Amino acid sequence: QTPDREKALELAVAQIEKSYGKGSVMRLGDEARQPISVIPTGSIALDVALGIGGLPRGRVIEIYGPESSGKTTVALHAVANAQAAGGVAAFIDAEHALDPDYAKKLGVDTDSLLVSQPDTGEQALEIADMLIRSGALDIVVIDSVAALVPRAELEGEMHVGLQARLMSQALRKMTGALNNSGTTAIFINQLTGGKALKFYASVRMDVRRVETLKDGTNAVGNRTRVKVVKNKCLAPFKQAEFDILYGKGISREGSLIDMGVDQGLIRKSGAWFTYEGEQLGQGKENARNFLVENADVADEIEKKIKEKLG
Numbered sequence: 001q002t003p004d005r006e007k008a009l010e011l012a013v014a015q016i017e018k019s020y021g022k023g024s025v026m027r028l029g030d031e032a033r034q035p036i037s038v039i040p041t042g043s044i045a046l047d048v049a050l051g052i053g054g055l056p057r058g059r060v061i062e063i064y065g066p067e068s069s070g071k072t073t074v075a076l077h078a079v080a081n082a083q084a085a086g087g088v089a090a091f092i093d094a095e096h097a098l099d100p101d102y103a104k105k106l107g108v109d110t111d112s113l114l115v116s117q118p119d120t121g122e123q124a125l126e127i128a129d130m131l132i133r134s135g136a137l138d139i140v141v142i143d144s145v146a147a148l149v150p151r152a153e154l155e156g157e158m159h160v161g162l163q164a165r166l167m168s169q170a171l172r173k174m175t176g177a178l179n180n181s182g183t184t185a186i187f188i189n190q191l192t193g194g195k196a197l198k199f200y201a202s203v204r205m206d207v208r209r210v211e212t213l214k215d216g217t218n219a220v221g222n223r224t225r226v227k228v229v230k231n232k233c234l235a236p237f238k239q240a241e242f243d244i245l246y247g248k249g250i251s252r253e254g255s256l257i258d259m260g261v262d263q264g265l266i267r268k269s270g271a272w273f274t275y276e277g278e279q280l281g282q283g284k285e286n287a288r289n290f291l292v293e294n295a296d297v298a299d300e301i302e303k304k305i306k307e308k309l310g
């Protein structure tokens, strides 16, 4: 007995998907799904590494990694895009360390940015809940899961396992509104909420800095590598690398060439980087430079790789 198995299995998956959701069972090869709702990340690589071409709306994402790696950047980038399309964002601050200049440089209309700075972890998630429940916000981001210390541990009365309780609680309740409003919550994790977020979260991102981007002088950026460890929206375990310039953020340009060569649209005749005959430049950075100053052609590449995938 051979094929009827594949038909019994097709039903199996249908059965499951029915009671546990679209992404309850997947094949790592499935090119499946693709909505109209997606916040680009800033890098075409991470975009397609998400499969869905951006972040998924009405869902909670968790981006975790080591101090100084990419996260917040990625986040603020997700903030800057969910902004460029007239949506509005809130930044629930718990570390007190956002640098507006850098945000502005990435593109956050810092002025419209709903920022808040709670004095207890609990209060922190709630502000996020009602802010969410209004259906006004498109993207909301809670900076750091680890800094959300409980009122109790804050009042002095220290048991423990306060965090994992408060989180789960909030997450359970908070997971509902989200899918019912279309706001995507982004949680910066560090490295403790663990379990809770781990499961409610529909997309988990592992960000870590790979190499300290050498550029003649000292250092222009970092070549980050995000590893989407969980993806209830598209075949997980996919990943992406990209440069993050010091002060400039993710080089959408730098992403374009790399993808451009890994997809045949850009040819690298040894040192030179070609595109549809026209010579781009000599040296990834010289081409990055060329693209940024030549946006018209820049989104041309970005356009032609989209057609060939998402």
Ligand SMILES: Nc1ncnc2c1ncn2[C@@H]1O[C@H](COP(=O)(O)OP(=O)(O)O)[C@@H](O)[C@H]1O
Pocket (backbone or CB within 6 Å): 066, 067, 068, 069, 070, 071, 072, 073, 074, 099, 102, 221, 222, 244, 245, 246, 247, 248
């Ligand atoms: N104001 C800034 N000027 C230059 N580079 C910055 C600045 N803020 C962040 N970065 C870059 O981002 C890296 C850390 O990213 P950031 O968003 O602060 O945090 P994370 O990536 O950990 O979420 C730094 O190593 C640096 O490359």
Ligand code: ALF
Pocket (backbone or CB within 6 Å): 065, 066, 067, 068, 069, 070, 071, 072, 073
């Ligand atoms: F540089 Al970070 F979390 F902002 F490690």
